[PDB]
C-alpha cells in the first residue's frame with residue numbers, strides 16, 4: 164500500500180521503450196531521462212514506485228465548459244497517480260490544482276526550421292504567411308500564445324488559430340516531419356529541450372534558430388497538499404546542485420549525439 | 424498593513440535615481456525589481472514599502488553561530504515580509520524560507536574583455552596567467568566553495584589562495600577589474616548580469632562558453648507566510664503574460680548602450 168504510482172508520458176528521450184522491452188517487465192521496460200530522474204528521486208525520498216504511462220497520452224488541460232482535467236494532471240487530480248515525473252511544464256492554471264517542485268529543467272518555446280533555410284525569428288514569422296508555422300495542438304506551448312499579452316505573440320496566435328490549412332499538429336513527430344518535407348515553408352514552434360534533442364538525431368536536417376520566446380521549467384507534480392511534495396522539491400534542488408541533473412541531460416541528449 | 428519588502432541595491436534591479444534626493448518613499452528607487460515589486464503588489468492587492476537589507480548580503484548561515492544574515496535573515500527573523508531581489512533559489516535557503524517559482528532563469532558564467540584567449544571554465548582551470556574570481560559573498564562563490572566536481576574544485580583551490588585576491592566586493596568592482604586588467608582577469612558571475620554589462624559602454628566585455636549551472640531567482644517570504652501562494656501565482660501569471668520578459672527587455676536592451 165506504500166508504492167508510489169508515477170504517471171509519466173512516452174516522449175523521447177524522457178521515457179522510451181527499451182529495445183528488448185518485451186522480454187522485460189515493470190519499470191525495467193522503460194529508459195530515459197525521466198526514468199533515471201524517477202530512480203534518483205525515489206532513492207532520495209525513500210519510496211517504492213511503479214512507472215505508468217498516462218492513459219490518454221496528454222499532458223494536462225482543463226475543459227472550459229466542464230472544468231474537467233485530462234492527461235497526467237488529471238491522474239493526479241482525480242486520485243489515479245501519486246506523482247508525475249515527466250516533461251510537464253509548470254503553469255498558472257495547473258499550479259492552482261496540483262503542486263510542483265522547483266524546476267528540474269529550464270527551457271522555453273523555440274523555433275525549429277529546415278536546416279539550410281533562412282533563419283527566422285518570432286517577429287519575422289508574425290509578419291508573414293508564406294512560411295506557415297504552428298504548435299502542438301495541445302499543451303503549454305499552444306496555451307502560451309492563447310494567454311500572452313505580447314503584441315507579436317498575439318498576432319502570431321490570431322494567425323495560427325485562423326490558418327485554414329491547420330498549422331497545429333497532434334505529436335512532436337508530426338511537427339518535425341512537417342518541417343522536414345516543407346522545404347522551409349513550415350516552422351515548428353516547440354519547447355527548446357525537444358528542439359535540441361531532435362537537432363541531435365538523424366537525419367540531422369533541422370535546427371533551433373533564434374532565442375527562446377519565454378522562460379519556463381519542467382517540474383515534478385504531486386496532488387495538491389501531498390506530503391510527498393516537500394521531500395521531492397528538496398530532492399530536485401539537491402540533485403541539481405550536485406550537478407546530477409546536468410549529467411542526466413548530457414547523457415540523454417549530447418553523449419550519444421549523432422549529428423556532430 | 425504595509426508590507427515590508429527587503430531588497431538590495433544592484434543595477435539594474437534596484438537603484439536610487441539620479442535626483443532621488445528630491446523624491447520620497449518608493450519613488451526614490453527604480454529598476455527591474457522595483458517594477459516587479461509594483462506588479463506583484465498590484466496582483467496580490469497589498470501596499471508596500473521598499474527597504475534596503477541592512478548588511479548588504481543576500482543570505483547565508485554562519486557555520487559557527489547558525490545564524491542567517493542578509494535578506495534571508497531579515498525574513499527568517501521578523502524584519503521583512505517579503506524579499507524581491509536577484510536572490511538565487513538554493514537548497515539550504517529553501518529549507519528556511521518560501522520561494523515562488525523563478526521569475527528569472529540563469530546560471531554562472533564567464534565575463535572577459537573582448538580579445539581574451541579564454542573560451543571555457545575548463546580553460547581557466549588549466550592556467551593562472553589569467554586570474555579569475557567571484558563576488559566575495561553569495562551563491563556564485565558558494566557554488567565553487569561547496570563544489571565536489573574536479574574542474575570546479577581545482578578552480579576553487581586556486582581562488583581561495585590566489586595571492587592577489589581574486590575576489591571582488593561588488594559587481595561594479597569585478598567589471599572594472601575585467602576592463603582594467605588588460606585581459607588578465609576573467610570574472611565569474613550570474614549570466615543575467617553578464618548580459619547586462621555587455622549592453623553597457625564601453626562595450627568591451629563579453630560572455631564566453633555556456634553557463635556552469637542552471638538555476639533561478641525567486642521571490643522569498645517567511646516560512647509558512649500566507650503571502651506565499653498569492654505571490655507565486657502572481658509571478659507565474661506575470662511570466663505567462665510576458666511582463667517579465669518586457670521588464671528584462673526594458674532594463675537590458677531598450678536601455679542598452681551598445682547598439
Ligand SMILES: N[C@@H](Cn1cc(I)c(=O)[nH]c1=O)C(=O)O
Pocket residue numbers: 222223250251252253299301302303304305335352353354357
Ligand atoms: N510540456 C508541455 C507539453 N509540450 C511538450 C512539448 I516536447 C512541446 O513542444 N510543447 C508542449 O506544450 C505541457 O506540460 O503541457
Ligand SMILES: N[C@@H](Cn1cc(I)c(=O)[nH]c1=O)C(=O)O
Pocket residue numbers: 433481482509510511512558560561562563564594611612613616
Ligand atoms: N544571486 C546571488 C547573489 N549574486 C548576485 C550576482 I548580480 C552575481 O553575479 N552573483 C551572485 O552570487 C545570491 O542569491 O546569493
